[PDB]
């Protein structure tokens, strides 16, 4: 069937790049195209998971639950996954997503905070959902520490724990060391996954490193459709996996056509490895901060690059886009005061 199971997150992580403006027509077209190409798991949610639609992360044009529902009615072979963050989404949201056809529940916490998800994994399994756990911002802690947090998720019912390079900050061996540490700790209890960003231009290769280190699930997005400089492009993951003898069950030519003809037109522009993204990757900044930093930069007349650098220095983590406003005002205050 496959050596590695690919999850496409064009319709979840890509929601960041889309600024959560997806329509039913876009989701339906994309789900169908990916499904037909052989993609076994398609993630659909607000960029910040269930309950993400907000002032803080950006309002959805279309309620995510309707999009999940449409995705589940569209896909013939692919399973629909959805993301939720404890502290943002709730168990009630997970049950609602399940009722709408979602069958894979991906629960994400900051990499040091796995213990807040224990009840969520328990509920998800009781609802008959397959479980995946995300340890976000995984570059911020050492492999052995990450493995202990993975063990917490595993013990709670998690079937696959992901090393998640949220900031696109990991380089090659940094991914391998983390993946291997989780494999060594989890053994037969859970699979290990990797989900990387492209902020240092290493999305595809980091994913290869993860696979060689023992990862059995890999995230990408068609056309890189995702936060920051994007996610690993699935069409390229497939091309590369074909050449290195990693079976995915996805047809390279079909997924390339989907990426080009179906996914791309739904994007407001390409995902760029621009100065802002590079800064995030260099500074360890959570990728979804990108378009919020650009927004605050316009609002307050300060450079987005500066907001992003300072977010790094402040050690902000996933979910803290609100602090970008405080950073903007801090810059305006220092400019007036001359401090």
């Amino acid at each position: 069937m496959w050596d590695v199971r690919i999850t496409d997150t064009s319709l979840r992580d890509g929601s960041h790049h889309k600024r959560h403006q997806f329509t039913k027509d876009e989701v339906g077209a994309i789900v169908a195209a990916l499904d037909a190409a052989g993609v076994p798991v398609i993630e659909v949610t607000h960029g910040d998971g269930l309950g993400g639609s907000s002032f803080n992360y950006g309002f959805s044009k279309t309620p995510e639950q309707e999009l999940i529902k449409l995705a589940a009615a569209t896909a013939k072979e692919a399973r629909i996954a959805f993301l939720m963050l404890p502290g943002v989404g709730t168990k009630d949201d997970i049950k609602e997503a399940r009722d709408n056809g979602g069958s894979i529940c991906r629960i994400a916490t900051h990499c040091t905070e796995a213990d807040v998800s224990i009840q969520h994994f328990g509920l998800a399994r009781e609802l008959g959902l397959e479980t995946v756990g995300f340890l976000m911002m995984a570059h911020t802690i050492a492999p052995e520490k990450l493995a202990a947090q993975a063990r917490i998720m595993a013990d709670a019912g998690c079937q696959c724990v992901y090393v998640v390079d949220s900031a696109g900050a990991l380089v090659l061996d940094g991914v391998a060391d983390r993946v291997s540490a989780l494999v060594a700790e989890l053994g037969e209890d859970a699979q290990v996954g990797f989900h990387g960003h492209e902020n240092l231009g290493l999305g595809v290769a980091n994913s290869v490193a993860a696979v060689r280190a023992g990862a059995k699930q890999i995230d990408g997005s068609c056309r890189r459709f995702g936060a920051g400089a994007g996610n690993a492009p699935v069409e390229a993951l497939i091309g590369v996996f074909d050449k290195i003898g990693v079976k995915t069950g996805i047809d390279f030519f079909d997924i390339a056509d989907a990426a080009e003809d179906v996914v791309r037109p739904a994007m407001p522009a390409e995902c760029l490895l621009d100065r802002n993204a590079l800064i995030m990757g260099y500074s360890g900044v959570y990728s979804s901060f990108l378009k919020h930093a650009v927004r605050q930069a316009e609002r307050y007349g300060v450079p987005a690059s500066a907001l992003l650098h300072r977010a790094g220095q402040r050690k902000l983590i996933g979910g803290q886009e609100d602090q970008l406003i405080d950073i903007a005002l801090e810059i305006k205050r220092e400019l007036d005061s001359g401090a």
Partner: protein, 296 residues
């Protein structure tokens, strides 16, 4: 004459509360009630002159000189069992647990409405920190929606909030509506493990009319902040309230955004435990107001 109060519970919250109560002009802590004879909390209370026990609430309810007020920081299950016993015994209760058998109260918003309540609940730390801001906006204009984001040091989040993170988000969002006056509420909580531990901060977003009187809103927010400062000195406004026009991000809503930081008093809890400090500061405030209104 100071109202004589009992504290049920002997953990961090109870101990911090003990220290605040000793400083009180209106309240005199006299009893600390526990169940663990080993409890460090009970040891501290003894040293300071309080009568202590490890036989639980039944011991307290069998005392000749009944408390005027009881503060409980145990668990929802424990307080829910004790609450009917307080009411029958005619002892006013202030509940710092999630039990919520009585009305939730936020001092600048609805405390006055509930001064006669036999049992009052302190909702959540996020609620105590953010609901006064929501209230400050909604007393000026219609607020169809308000959203609060709490950021707290990981080390200052105990197994309580951790095991029940959903309840924090749901309960706080509910208070934002019912007490804050927003038509719909949302709450988010972020646990940040940065070292040194961060002082708690909170962002409050309120949807407001596009033609809202911004100066009146800003003035109201400043007024509520000064009010909260009378009982939480470390509660501070980080910026002027910020106003924004309808956009894609805001779903076509105009809004006002307020940033607070909540530094703890360092009584017993550390300054970076403003999430816990604000609970005991607010509880003390509610107790003092009840004592002034109904008990002197």
């Amino acid at each position: 004459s100071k109202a004589k109060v009992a504290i049920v519970g002997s953990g961090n919250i109870s101990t911090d509360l003990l220290y605040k109560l000793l400083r009180s002009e209106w309240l005199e802590p006299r009893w600390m009630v526990g169940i663990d004879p080993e409890s460090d909390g009970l040891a501290r209370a003894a040293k300071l002159g309080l009568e202590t026990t490890h036989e639980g609430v039944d011991w307290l309810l069998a005392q000749p000189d009944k408390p005027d007020l009881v503060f409980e920081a145990t668990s929802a299950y424990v307080h829910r069992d004790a609450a009917p016993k307080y009411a029958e015994a005619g002892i006013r209760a202030i509940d710092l647990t999630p039990a919520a058998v009585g009305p939730a109260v936020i001092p600048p918003a609805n405390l006055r409405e509930h001064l006669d309540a036999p049992n009052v609940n302190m909702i959540t730390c996020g609620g105590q920190a953010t609901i006064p801001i929501v209230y400050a906006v909604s007393r000026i204009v219609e607020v169809p929606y308000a959203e609060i984001v709490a950021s707290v040091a990981s080390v200052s989040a105990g197994p309580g909030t951790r095991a029940n993170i959903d309840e924090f988000t749901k309960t706080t969002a509910r208070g934002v509506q019912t007490i804050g006056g927003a038509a719909r509420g949302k709450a988010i909580i972020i646990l940040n493990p940065a070292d040194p531990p961060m002082i708690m901060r909170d962002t409050i977003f309120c949807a407001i009319p596009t033609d809202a009187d911004r100066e009146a809103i800003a003035a109201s927010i400043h007024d509520v902040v000064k009010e909260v400062q009378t009982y939480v000195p470390g509660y501070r406004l980080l910026n002027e309230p910020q106003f924004d026009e309808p956009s894609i991000n805001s779903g076509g809503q105009a809004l006002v955004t307020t940033f607070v930081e909540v530094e703890g008093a360092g009584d017993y809890l550390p300054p970076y435990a403003g999430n816990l400090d604000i609970m005991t500061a607010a509880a003390t405030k509610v107790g003092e107001e009840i004592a002034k209104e109904t008990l002197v």
